[PDB]
Symmetry: C2
Amino acid sequence: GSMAVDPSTIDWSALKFSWLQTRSHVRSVWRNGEWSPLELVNEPTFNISIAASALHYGQAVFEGLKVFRTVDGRVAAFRPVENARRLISSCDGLCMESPSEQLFLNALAMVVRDNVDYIPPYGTGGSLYVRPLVIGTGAQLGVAPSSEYMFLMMVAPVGPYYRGGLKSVNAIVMDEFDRAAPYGVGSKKCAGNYAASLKAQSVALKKSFPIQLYLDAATHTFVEEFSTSNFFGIKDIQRDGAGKIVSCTYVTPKSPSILPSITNKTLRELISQYFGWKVDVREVPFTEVKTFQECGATGTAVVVTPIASITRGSTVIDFLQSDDQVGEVTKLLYETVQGIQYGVIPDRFNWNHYIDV
Amino acid sequence: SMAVDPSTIDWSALKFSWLQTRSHVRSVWRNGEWSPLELVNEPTFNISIAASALHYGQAVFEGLKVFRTVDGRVAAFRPVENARRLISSCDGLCMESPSEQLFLNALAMVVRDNVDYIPPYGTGGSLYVRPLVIGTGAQLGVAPSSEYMFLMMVAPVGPYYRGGLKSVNAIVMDEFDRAAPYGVGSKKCAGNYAASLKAQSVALKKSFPIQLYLDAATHTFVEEFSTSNFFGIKDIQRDGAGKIVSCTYVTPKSPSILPSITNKTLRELISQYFGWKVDVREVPFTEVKTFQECGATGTAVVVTPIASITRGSTVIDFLQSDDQVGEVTKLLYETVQGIQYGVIPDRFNWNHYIDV
Ligand SMILES: [Cl-]
Ligand SMILES: [Mg+2]
């Protein structure tokens, strides 16, 4: 019976990326062919069958997107239609029912309006993290798709991921670990993929690597992605007489096993249609990694994680000399995404879904 | 929702379905310890909307059976094997786990409390026991949960074969894997089963009730079925009356395979009880057509005789009718059940008796 955090007392500057109990979440339940009307729920728990399919047989997928208080005082969700469609794709891959795009967008507006006082104010660099979830809740023993599903959407304010500037990190390649089967569910944002990566995480954390890069499980010769973020590389950077970048190539792996990052898609669209440079979505052999001039990971919580080095066995590929250093194009991407998200750069590609609050 | 009245259950008509009994047993882990076991009558619990099990998949389970035996006692079949595998599955997903003794304490408690749901001797039914460990701490970052819950629930299930073994047709899923080469295929974890459902629906649409996987790494070696191990029987030799006196039990070896306790039981029966040959090794798919019998094995079925295996356009036929069944397969089925129900002496002390 725990109480909501008082929004008027939240020190936004101390926020990191943690669970925080806001006023409400929204809920809908599927049975007999239809979702029930969306409802606000104040208590951050629900009653689940001890036999729920989500707990025994893994029918559980989720999403992640951000809502922002913009420079002119409005509220916008960043590309939520992309999340609604990926949620449907994750559900389908696990034989789960899913809310339609419109039900998803209705849930978002409903939950954002009821928790509007939890959106970190403009100037904090914070945001409202949105976590949609679909889980099989029917009680069953045989291994089969559940007959009942629940769609939840919860929110929590998070602080600026980079309080005080972009920082680069060291990555390790997991040679004795896979994150996805070649013909598996690596492209679905499903619960099981994350627990299946925890053992590799602890091995990498014990060696002081905050991020783990995976190669393709089939041959272990091509870059796949990090455990919770896509991989990209930058090369062929060319500049004019003023030092301005006038050309470069953004490279990112292509594979049915890779989670299709919406931030990655955003970066590709910025590289080619906003800045007018080259984008390559193709197989990235690991031997090519040493030819990249910049390397990064991409995902909603970080936008980008600049990669200072990649370690595989005893071979080290060094991109940046210090964690203070970050790739120039990588930083440009970060600032351009954030400029659009917060309303400072005009939203040329209509990525911002404004919510009337 | 109310518990099913045990005096109204038609034991012989039961299949393998969820049924609400009197109670389950629960313990929660926090701050370094599991809480004292408690019986809970209501078959739901309050779970955080941000629970690690729901978002990041820290959820593993077990399955074993409890039997009312011929002399009136109650026994669980090899429950220490389940306790040790539960710990192994938990370790693989960086989850806390109950100790063997806590698991056995939980088992005796839930079995005694639900004794009226154990199908009586003569029914061929049993009490299926479903242990479960789940991450229950609320968290946003991907990391092992700080809180876990241990549940053990039960349901009566009927005789899987009411009226003799029945064989089935299997299909090899060439465009689907069940486990990565360096993944969690050897852990009995929730995510493995949802990840198999798409392949399952494709096979059912073609009228195949069981799906066989080859190794994800090369697709040339037998791995296992989606929820049961594979074995083959060959080199069958008989005495002058046709009694089987020699054979070879072959089952695939791989770090991706869930180590089936029923498979382990069959290997121990073949070698230590009957004195025949057991080979735990890789089985290239080209060898499958040389098996005289083929089977799937797991707790719910004991064995499923495999009548045929279809891969692409190639069909391997083992049995001509769903009525016809391989003799070694049937012997193994009857010997396991004979031990489970107390009719065959429990030479290897596999039966864990529970005071009820
Ligand atoms: Cl313990
Ligand atoms: Mg322990």
